[PDB]
Amino acid sequence: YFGGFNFSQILPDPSKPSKRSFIEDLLFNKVTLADAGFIKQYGDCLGDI
Amino acid sequence: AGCLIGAEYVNNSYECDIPIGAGICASYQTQSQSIIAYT
Numbered sequence A: 001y002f003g004g005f006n007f008s009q010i011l012p013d014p015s016k017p018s019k020r021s022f023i024e025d026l027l028f029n030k031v032t033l034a035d036a037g038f039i040k041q042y043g044d045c046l047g048d049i
Numbered sequence B: 001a002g003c004l005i006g007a008e009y010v011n012n013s014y015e016c017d018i019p020i021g022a023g024i025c026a027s028y029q030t031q032s033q034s035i036i037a038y039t
Ligand SMILES: *[C@@H]1O[C@H](CO)[C@@H](O)[C@H](O)[C@H]1NC(C)=O
Pocket: A006, A007, A008
């Protein structure tokens, strides 16, 4: 309760293991990535699929 | 960021000293005197 102001859509939602809000989830889902190599991908590059 | 040989992980948290990768930092601490890695 913050005087009737609703902050539940920008405060974190701890239901998921990444403590992110709803609007932050939309922002992270809308920006599509090029799948950069910041996570290792040598095993996937070795296995020719 | 790959894997690290020669530094032992600790279940603590300090300020970053040597940045390694995705949240992992390394330092030269006493827990003897050796290189440790942490979050
Ligand atoms: C805040 O908004 C959400 C969705 O817009 C709603 O589910 C929630 O009940 C609201 N909070 C309060 C205290 O009514």
